[PDB]
Coordinates of C-alpha atoms and ligand atoms in Angstrom, one line a residue:
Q1 CA -18.9 1.2 -3.0
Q2 CA -21.6 -1.3 -3.7
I3 CA -22.2 -2.9 -7.2
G4 CA -24.6 -1.1 -9.5
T5 CA -26.9 -2.6 -12.2
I6 CA -25.0 -1.9 -15.5
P7 CA -23.6 -5.4 -16.1
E8 CA -19.8 -6.0 -16.0
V9 CA -19.0 -8.2 -19.0
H10 CA -15.3 -9.1 -19.1
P11 CA -13.8 -9.6 -22.6
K12 CA -12.6 -13.2 -22.8
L13 CA -8.9 -13.9 -23.3
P14 CA -7.8 -17.5 -23.3
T15 CA -4.3 -18.2 -22.0
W16 CA -2.1 -21.3 -21.6
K17 CA -0.3 -23.1 -18.7
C18 CA 2.5 -25.2 -20.1
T19 CA 4.5 -28.1 -18.7
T20 CA 7.4 -30.2 -20.0
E21 CA 5.6 -33.5 -19.8
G22 CA 2.0 -32.3 -20.3
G23 CA 2.3 -29.6 -22.9
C24 CA 0.0 -26.5 -22.9
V25 CA -3.5 -26.4 -21.4
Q26 CA -5.9 -23.6 -22.2
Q27 CA -7.3 -21.5 -19.3
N28 CA -10.7 -19.8 -19.6
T29 CA -9.3 -16.5 -18.5
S30 CA -10.7 -13.1 -19.2
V31 CA -9.7 -9.5 -18.7
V32 CA -11.0 -6.7 -16.4
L33 CA -10.6 -2.9 -16.7
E34 CA -9.1 -0.8 -13.9
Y35 CA -11.6 0.1 -11.1
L36 CA -11.3 3.8 -11.8
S37 CA -12.3 3.1 -15.5
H38 CA -15.7 2.0 -14.3
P39 CA -18.4 4.6 -13.5
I40 CA -18.4 5.2 -9.7
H41 CA -21.4 7.5 -8.9
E42 CA -23.9 8.4 -6.2
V43 CA -26.7 6.0 -5.5
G44 CA -29.3 8.5 -6.4
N45 CA -27.7 10.2 -9.3
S46 CA -25.4 8.8 -12.0
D47 CA -24.3 12.4 -12.8
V48 CA -22.6 12.9 -9.4
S49 CA -19.3 11.0 -9.6
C50 CA -17.6 9.7 -6.5
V51 CA -14.2 10.1 -8.1
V52 CA -13.7 13.7 -9.3
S53 CA -10.4 15.3 -10.4
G54 CA -8.8 11.9 -9.9
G55 CA -9.6 12.0 -6.1
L56 CA -12.4 11.3 -3.7
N57 CA -15.6 13.4 -3.6
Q58 CA -15.2 14.4 0.0
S59 CA -19.0 15.0 0.5
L60 CA -19.7 11.4 -0.4
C61 CA -16.5 9.6 0.6
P62 CA -15.2 11.0 3.9
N63 CA -14.4 7.4 5.0
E64 CA -14.9 3.8 3.9
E65 CA -18.4 3.3 5.4
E66 CA -19.9 6.5 4.1
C67 CA -18.3 5.9 0.7
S68 CA -19.6 2.4 0.6
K69 CA -23.1 3.5 1.3
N70 CA -23.2 6.6 -1.0
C71 CA -21.5 5.2 -4.0
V72 CA -22.0 2.4 -6.6
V73 CA -19.5 1.1 -9.1
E74 CA -21.0 0.3 -12.5
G75 CA -20.2 -2.0 -15.4
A76 CA -17.8 -0.5 -18.0
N77 CA -18.1 -0.1 -21.7
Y78 CA -14.9 -1.9 -22.8
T79 CA -14.9 -0.7 -26.4
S80 CA -15.3 3.0 -25.5
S81 CA -12.3 2.3 -23.1
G82 CA -10.2 1.0 -26.0
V83 CA -10.2 -2.7 -25.1
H84 CA -10.9 -5.5 -27.6
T85 CA -10.3 -9.2 -27.6
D86 CA -10.5 -11.5 -30.6
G87 CA -9.7 -15.1 -30.0
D88 CA -6.4 -15.2 -28.0
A89 CA -5.5 -11.6 -28.8
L90 CA -6.0 -8.5 -26.7
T91 CA -5.9 -5.1 -28.5
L92 CA -5.4 -1.9 -26.5
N93 CA -6.2 1.4 -28.3
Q94 CA -4.6 4.6 -26.8
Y95 CA -7.4 6.7 -28.3
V96 CA -11.1 6.3 -29.2
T97 CA -13.3 8.6 -31.3
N98 CA -16.8 10.0 -31.2
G99 CA -16.8 11.5 -34.7
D100 CA -14.5 14.5 -35.0
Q101 CA -13.4 14.3 -31.3
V102 CA -10.5 12.1 -30.2
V103 CA -10.7 10.8 -26.6
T104 CA -7.8 9.5 -24.5
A105 CA -8.8 5.9 -23.5
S106 CA -5.4 4.5 -22.4
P107 CA -6.7 1.3 -20.8
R108 CA -5.2 -0.8 -18.1
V109 CA -6.6 -4.3 -17.6
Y110 CA -5.9 -7.3 -15.4
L111 CA -6.1 -11.1 -16.1
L112 CA -9.0 -12.7 -14.3
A113 CA -9.0 -16.4 -13.4
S114 CA -12.8 -16.5 -13.0
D115 CA -15.8 -14.4 -13.9
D116 CA -17.8 -15.6 -10.9
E117 CA -19.1 -13.2 -8.3
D118 CA -16.1 -14.0 -6.1
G119 CA -13.6 -14.7 -9.0
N120 CA -10.0 -13.6 -8.3
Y121 CA -7.2 -12.5 -10.5
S122 CA -4.9 -15.1 -11.9
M123 CA -1.9 -15.4 -9.5
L124 CA 0.9 -16.2 -11.9
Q125 CA 3.8 -18.0 -10.1
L126 CA 6.8 -17.5 -12.4
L127 CA 9.7 -18.4 -10.1
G128 CA 11.7 -21.1 -12.0
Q129 CA 9.2 -20.6 -14.9
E130 CA 8.9 -18.7 -18.1
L131 CA 6.3 -16.5 -19.7
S132 CA 5.9 -16.1 -23.5
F133 CA 3.6 -13.9 -25.5
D134 CA 3.3 -12.8 -29.1
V135 CA 3.1 -9.0 -29.6
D136 CA 2.4 -6.6 -32.5
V137 CA 4.1 -3.2 -31.6
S138 CA 4.3 -2.0 -35.2
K139 CA 1.7 0.7 -34.5
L140 CA 3.4 2.0 -31.3
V141 CA 5.2 5.2 -32.3
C142 CA 7.8 7.3 -30.3
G143 CA 6.5 8.2 -26.9
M144 CA 4.1 5.2 -26.7
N145 CA 4.4 2.5 -24.1
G146 CA 2.6 -0.8 -24.5
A147 CA 3.2 -2.7 -21.3
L148 CA 2.8 -6.2 -20.0
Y149 CA 3.9 -6.7 -16.4
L150 CA 3.2 -8.2 -13.0
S151 CA 2.1 -6.6 -9.7
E152 CA 1.8 -8.2 -6.3
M153 CA -1.8 -7.0 -6.0
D154 CA -4.2 -8.9 -3.7
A155 CA -5.8 -11.9 -5.5
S156 CA -9.3 -10.5 -4.6
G157 CA -8.4 -6.9 -5.3
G158 CA -9.3 -5.9 -1.8
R159 CA -12.7 -7.4 -1.8
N160 CA -14.7 -7.0 1.5
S161 CA -18.2 -6.1 2.5
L162 CA -17.6 -2.3 2.0
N163 CA -15.8 -3.0 -1.4
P164 CA -17.8 -6.0 -2.7
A165 CA -16.6 -5.3 -6.2
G166 CA -13.0 -6.7 -5.8
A167 CA -11.2 -8.3 -8.8
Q168 CA -14.5 -8.5 -10.7
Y169 CA -14.4 -4.7 -11.1
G170 CA -10.7 -4.1 -11.4
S171 CA -10.0 -3.2 -7.7
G172 CA -6.8 -3.1 -5.8
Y173 CA -4.1 -2.0 -8.2
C174 CA -0.6 -1.2 -7.0
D175 CA 2.9 -1.1 -8.4
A176 CA 6.4 0.0 -7.5
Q177 CA 5.6 3.7 -8.3
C178 CA 3.6 4.0 -5.1
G179 CA 1.1 6.3 -6.9
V180 CA -1.5 8.3 -4.9
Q181 CA -4.9 7.0 -5.8
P182 CA -8.4 7.3 -4.2
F183 CA -8.8 3.7 -3.2
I184 CA -5.9 1.5 -2.0
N185 CA -6.6 -2.3 -1.7
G186 CA -10.3 -1.6 -1.9
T187 CA -10.2 1.0 0.9
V188 CA -10.8 4.7 0.7
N189 CA -7.6 6.7 0.7
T190 CA -8.8 10.0 2.3
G191 CA -5.3 11.5 2.1
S192 CA -2.2 11.2 0.1
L193 CA -1.2 7.5 0.7
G194 CA 0.4 5.7 -2.2
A195 CA -0.3 2.1 -3.4
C196 CA 3.0 0.1 -3.4
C197 CA 3.9 -3.4 -4.2
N198 CA 6.6 -5.5 -5.9
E199 CA 6.4 -5.0 -9.7
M200 CA 8.0 -7.0 -12.5
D201 CA 8.0 -5.1 -15.8
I202 CA 8.4 -7.9 -18.3
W203 CA 7.6 -5.6 -21.2
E204 CA 7.6 -1.9 -21.8
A205 CA 7.9 -1.1 -25.4
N206 CA 7.1 0.6 -28.7
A207 CA 8.4 -0.2 -32.2
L208 CA 11.6 1.7 -31.5
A209 CA 12.8 0.4 -28.0
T210 CA 12.0 -2.0 -25.2
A211 CA 12.8 -2.3 -21.5
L212 CA 12.7 -5.2 -19.0
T213 CA 12.7 -3.8 -15.4
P214 CA 12.4 -5.5 -12.0
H215 CA 11.2 -3.1 -9.3
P216 CA 11.5 -4.6 -5.8
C217 CA 9.9 -3.3 -2.6
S218 CA 10.7 -4.0 1.0
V219 CA 7.1 -5.1 1.6
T220 CA 5.1 -8.2 0.5
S221 CA 1.8 -7.7 -1.4
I222 CA 0.1 -4.3 -1.4
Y223 CA 1.1 -1.5 1.0
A224 CA -0.2 2.0 1.6
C225 CA 2.9 4.3 1.9
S226 CA 3.0 7.6 3.7
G227 CA 5.5 10.4 3.2
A228 CA 9.1 9.5 2.5
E229 CA 8.0 5.8 2.3
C230 CA 6.6 6.9 -1.1
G231 CA 9.9 8.4 -2.2
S232 CA 12.1 7.2 -5.0
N233 CA 14.2 5.1 -2.6
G234 CA 11.4 4.5 0.0
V235 CA 9.7 1.2 0.5
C236 CA 9.9 0.7 -3.3
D237 CA 12.5 1.0 -6.0
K238 CA 10.9 3.4 -8.5
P239 CA 13.8 3.5 -11.0
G240 CA 14.2 -0.2 -11.1
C241 CA 16.8 -2.3 -12.9
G242 CA 16.1 -1.4 -16.5
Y243 CA 17.4 -3.7 -19.3
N244 CA 17.2 -2.1 -22.8
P245 CA 19.4 -3.6 -25.6
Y246 CA 19.7 -0.3 -27.4
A247 CA 21.1 1.4 -24.2
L248 CA 23.4 -1.6 -23.4
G249 CA 25.3 -1.5 -26.7
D250 CA 23.5 -2.8 -29.7
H251 CA 21.6 -0.2 -31.7
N252 CA 20.6 -2.8 -34.3
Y253 CA 19.1 -5.5 -32.1
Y254 CA 15.5 -4.2 -31.8
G255 CA 13.4 -2.0 -34.0
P256 CA 12.1 -1.6 -37.6
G257 CA 14.0 -3.8 -40.0
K258 CA 16.4 -4.9 -37.2
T259 CA 17.3 -8.3 -35.7
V260 CA 14.0 -8.4 -33.8
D261 CA 12.0 -6.7 -36.6
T262 CA 9.3 -4.6 -34.9
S263 CA 7.7 -3.9 -38.4
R264 CA 5.8 -7.2 -37.8
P265 CA 4.8 -9.5 -35.0
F266 CA 7.1 -11.5 -32.8
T267 CA 7.3 -13.7 -29.7
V268 CA 8.8 -12.5 -26.3
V269 CA 10.1 -15.2 -23.9
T270 CA 11.1 -14.3 -20.4
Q271 CA 12.8 -16.9 -18.1
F272 CA 13.1 -16.5 -14.4
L273 CA 16.0 -18.9 -13.7
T274 CA 16.8 -20.2 -10.2
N275 CA 20.1 -21.4 -8.9
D276 CA 18.9 -25.0 -8.6
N277 CA 16.6 -25.1 -11.6
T278 CA 13.5 -25.6 -9.4
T279 CA 10.4 -23.5 -8.7
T280 CA 11.6 -23.1 -5.1
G281 CA 15.2 -22.1 -5.6
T282 CA 16.6 -18.5 -5.6
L283 CA 16.0 -16.3 -8.6
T284 CA 19.5 -15.6 -9.9
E285 CA 19.0 -14.7 -13.6
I286 CA 16.3 -13.2 -15.8
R287 CA 16.8 -14.2 -19.5
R288 CA 15.1 -12.8 -22.6
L289 CA 14.6 -14.6 -26.0
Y290 CA 12.7 -13.6 -29.0
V291 CA 11.2 -15.8 -31.7
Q292 CA 10.5 -14.4 -35.2
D293 CA 10.3 -16.2 -38.5
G294 CA 10.6 -19.5 -36.6
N295 CA 14.1 -18.5 -35.4
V296 CA 15.1 -18.2 -31.7
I297 CA 16.9 -14.9 -31.3
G298 CA 19.0 -14.8 -28.1
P299 CA 20.7 -11.9 -26.3
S300 CA 22.8 -9.7 -28.5
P301 CA 26.6 -10.5 -28.1
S302 CA 27.1 -6.8 -28.6
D303 CA 25.3 -5.9 -25.4
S304 CA 27.5 -5.5 -22.3
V305 CA 25.6 -8.2 -20.6
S306 CA 23.4 -11.0 -21.8
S307 CA 20.8 -11.2 -19.0
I308 CA 19.7 -9.5 -15.8
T309 CA 21.6 -10.4 -12.7
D310 CA 22.2 -8.8 -9.3
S311 CA 25.6 -7.4 -10.4
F312 CA 24.2 -6.0 -13.6
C313 CA 21.4 -4.3 -11.6
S314 CA 23.8 -2.8 -9.1
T315 CA 25.6 -1.2 -12.0
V316 CA 22.3 0.5 -13.1
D317 CA 20.3 0.8 -9.8
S318 CA 22.0 1.2 -6.5
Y319 CA 18.7 0.5 -4.5
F320 CA 17.9 -2.8 -6.2
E321 CA 20.0 -5.0 -3.8
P322 CA 19.1 -3.2 -0.5
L323 CA 15.5 -4.1 -1.2
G324 CA 16.4 -7.8 -1.6
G325 CA 17.5 -7.9 -5.3
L326 CA 16.5 -10.8 -7.4
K327 CA 16.1 -13.2 -4.5
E328 CA 13.2 -11.2 -3.0
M329 CA 11.9 -10.4 -6.5
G330 CA 11.7 -14.2 -7.1
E331 CA 10.0 -14.7 -3.8
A332 CA 7.3 -12.3 -5.0
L333 CA 7.1 -14.2 -8.3
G334 CA 6.8 -17.4 -6.2
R335 CA 4.0 -16.1 -4.0
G336 CA 2.1 -15.1 -7.2
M337 CA 1.4 -11.9 -9.0
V338 CA -1.3 -10.3 -11.2
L339 CA -0.8 -10.0 -15.0
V340 CA -1.4 -6.4 -16.1
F341 CA -1.7 -5.0 -19.7
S342 CA -1.7 -1.3 -20.4
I343 CA -1.1 1.3 -23.1
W344 CA -0.2 4.9 -22.2
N345 CA 1.9 7.9 -23.2
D346 CA 3.6 10.7 -21.2
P347 CA 2.8 14.4 -21.2
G348 CA 5.8 15.0 -18.9
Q349 CA 8.9 13.4 -20.4
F350 CA 7.4 11.9 -23.6
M351 CA 8.8 8.4 -22.7
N352 CA 12.3 9.8 -23.4
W353 CA 13.6 7.3 -20.8
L354 CA 12.4 4.4 -23.0
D355 CA 13.1 5.3 -26.6
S356 CA 15.2 8.5 -26.8
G357 CA 18.7 9.7 -25.9
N358 CA 20.8 6.7 -24.9
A359 CA 17.8 4.5 -24.8
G360 CA 16.5 4.6 -28.4
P361 CA 16.4 6.4 -31.7
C362 CA 13.5 8.8 -31.1
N363 CA 13.9 12.5 -31.6
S364 CA 13.4 14.1 -28.2
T365 CA 10.1 15.8 -29.0
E366 CA 8.7 13.1 -31.3
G367 CA 6.7 11.5 -28.4
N368 CA 4.8 14.6 -27.4
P369 CA 1.3 13.3 -26.7
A370 CA 0.0 16.3 -28.6
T371 CA 1.6 15.2 -31.9
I372 CA 0.8 11.5 -31.1
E373 CA -2.9 12.4 -30.9
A374 CA -2.8 14.7 -33.9
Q375 CA -0.9 12.3 -36.2
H376 CA -1.2 8.8 -34.8
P377 CA -4.7 8.5 -33.2
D378 CA -4.8 4.8 -34.2
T379 CA -1.8 3.8 -32.1
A380 CA -2.4 0.5 -30.4
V381 CA -0.8 -2.7 -29.2
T382 CA -1.9 -6.3 -29.7
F383 CA -0.8 -9.1 -27.2
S384 CA -1.7 -12.7 -28.0
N385 CA -0.8 -16.3 -27.4
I386 CA 0.0 -15.8 -23.7
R387 CA 1.6 -18.9 -22.1
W388 CA 3.5 -19.5 -18.9
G389 CA 4.9 -22.6 -17.4
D390 CA 8.0 -24.8 -17.3
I391 CA 11.2 -23.4 -18.8
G392 CA 11.2 -24.3 -22.5
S393 CA 7.6 -25.4 -22.6
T394 CA 5.9 -22.2 -23.7
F395 CA 7.5 -21.6 -27.1
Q396 CA 8.5 -23.0 -30.6
Ligands
LIG1 C1 -6.1 -6.2 1.1 O1 -7.5 -6.2 1.3 C2 -8.1 -7.6 1.4 C3 -9.6 -7.4 1.6 O2 -9.9 -6.8 2.8 C4 -7.4 -8.2 2.7 O3 -7.9 -9.5 2.8 C5 -8.4 -9.9 4.0 O4 -7.5 -9.8 5.2 C6 -8.2 -10.0 6.4 C7 -7.1 -9.8 7.5 O5 -7.1 -8.5 8.0 C8 -8.8 -11.4 6.5 O6 -9.6 -11.5 7.6 C9 -9.3 -12.5 8.5 O7 -9.5 -13.7 7.6 C10 -9.2 -14.9 8.2 C11 -9.3 -16.0 7.2 O8 -8.6 -17.2 7.6 C12 -10.1 -15.2 9.4 O9 -9.8 -16.4 10.0 C13 -9.9 -14.0 10.5 O10 -10.7 -14.2 11.6 C14 -10.1 -12.6 9.8 O11 -11.5 -12.5 9.5 C15 -9.7 -11.6 5.2 O12 -10.1 -13.0 5.2 C16 -9.0 -11.3 3.9 N1 -9.9 -11.4 2.8 C17 -9.5 -11.9 1.6 C18 -10.6 -11.9 0.5 O13 -8.4 -12.3 1.4 C19 -5.9 -8.2 2.6 O14 -5.4 -8.6 3.8 C20 -5.4 -6.8 2.3 N2 -4.0 -6.9 2.0 C21 -3.0 -6.2 2.7 C22 -1.6 -6.5 2.3 O15 -3.3 -5.4 3.5
LIG2 C1 -11.9 -24.1 -20.4 O1 -13.3 -24.4 -20.8 C2 -13.6 -25.7 -21.1 C3 -15.1 -25.7 -21.3 O2 -15.8 -25.3 -20.2 C4 -13.2 -26.7 -19.9 O3 -13.5 -28.0 -20.3 C5 -11.8 -26.5 -19.6 O4 -11.4 -27.3 -18.5 C6 -11.5 -25.0 -19.2 N1 -10.1 -24.8 -18.8 C7 -9.7 -24.9 -17.5 C8 -8.3 -24.7 -17.2 O5 -10.5 -25.2 -16.6
LIG3 C1 -19.9 1.7 -26.0 O1 -19.5 3.0 -26.6 C2 -19.5 2.9 -28.1 C3 -19.0 4.3 -28.5 O2 -18.4 5.0 -27.5 C4 -20.9 2.6 -28.6 O3 -20.8 2.4 -30.0 C5 -21.4 1.3 -27.9 O4 -22.7 1.0 -28.3 C6 -21.3 1.4 -26.4 N1 -21.9 0.3 -25.7 C7 -22.9 0.3 -24.9 C8 -23.3 -1.0 -24.3 O5 -23.4 1.4 -24.6
LIG4 C1 18.8 -24.6 -15.7 O1 18.0 -24.2 -16.8 C2 18.7 -23.7 -18.0 C3 17.6 -23.4 -19.0 O2 18.0 -24.0 -20.3 C4 19.6 -24.8 -18.5 O3 20.3 -24.3 -19.6 C5 20.6 -25.2 -17.4 O4 21.5 -26.2 -17.8 C6 19.9 -25.6 -16.1 N1 20.8 -25.9 -15.0 C7 21.8 -25.0 -14.6 C8 22.6 -25.5 -13.5 O5 21.8 -23.8 -15.0
LIG5 C1 13.4 16.8 -34.0 O1 14.2 17.6 -33.1 C2 14.3 19.0 -33.4 C3 15.2 19.6 -32.4 O2 14.6 20.9 -31.9 C4 12.9 19.6 -33.4 O3 13.0 21.0 -33.9 C5 11.9 18.8 -34.3 O4 10.6 19.3 -34.2 C6 12.0 17.4 -33.9 N1 11.1 16.6 -34.8 C7 9.9 16.1 -34.5 C8 9.4 16.5 -33.1 O5 9.2 15.5 -35.3

């Protein structure tokens, strides 16, 4: 699909790269909506969409050349898609409103390194490094998921002559869920392939519960899976090695009025520690700290473990180590990965895996999207003050 005329204007979102000796240095980064959140329509006629019912218009897109000729991708309206930036803060709204009508926006955005015509995503290399961000989750109710994570997408988003849009229009998404989507790495997916790649879920959370989940794959960068390759233990680890402090033994660590008080903003620090403390060693531990009220809050001693390691993970996820465990996870982090921000909810299981049952305090039906939309249409997440770099150099 070629590039139409409605301009694509990326909300600016400064970030920081930090070092022990040099301190933090601001990057002129910005943020881009998912490709499929852009209008993609026929050259003649902006009423004829090329993506209908979440799949390809077969008349226009039987293959990549025909789709490239028949279709154009347009610039997106970021506010109607629920995306706002103010200084160093990104706000993602789940819902937007005409007047009486509420519209599911549920945006997903990617961090861009450049806004040039050939600008690529930022390729964060976090092996032997840390990432910190401030977050306000106080408006994220049961069933909501505000997420900040990493995917081994292609730095150009699959840019080529038939997909000239690339990273500048949000192209090339993939994750460990191997989801079926109409374009994979910038190429038309005519039939049922899934878009797979290593995924590091730094942050999935609402005000009631939080999870940190590495999801390894047996591939490097993006991969179109077929058949059983897309299964739950196929080329990727769909369940992943989930770390949730409520589930692991401390119901008073995280939440409203709790040790990490989600009633008000806080800082999330994630350290990817290597055996030899270098950015080229082997990832052997993932460690989580919070900062709130100028206090560093370490792992709860009431939790069964204090960090993610391979032996932890094998207790919760028997497919983590066959796909290379933390060593290959760290190799993906060392090659470089795309920073992804999203907000979403779940008409199927209501996020009960995140915040209900053993995992959190929510009533089983509290996170029904129907009640969320009726009662909490303003639910939203704000990420800010995003910094990555040398261990210890990104926070207080
Ligand atoms: C995802 O899609 C992108 C965009 O098509 C793929 O990137 C491209 O990969 C091809 C290889 O099939 C590269 O072509 C070759 O490039 C080298 C450059 O040194 C050239 O010497 C060769 O003669 C050949 O033309 C192309 O450069 C590259 N483009 C970009 C922007 O990186 C990518 O491979 C796909 N990823 C996966 C995992 O399939
Ligand atoms: C951010 O923008 C300013 C002004 O153009 C520039 O001086 C600075 O070098 C930029 N940051 C980076 C990392 O290039
Ligand atoms: C984007 O949409 C909102 C409402 O949906 C509207 O107020 C705004 O003017 C739109 N922007 C453009 C450029 O059309
Ligand atoms: C590696 O970095 C951590 C981070 O503070 C530090 O505590 C530790 O002493 C370093 N060395 C080893 C061998 O863990
Ligand atoms: C809490 O759970 C009970 C169990 O059936 C349910 O009847 C009630 O509606 C739930 N509360 C909500 C969804 O707010």
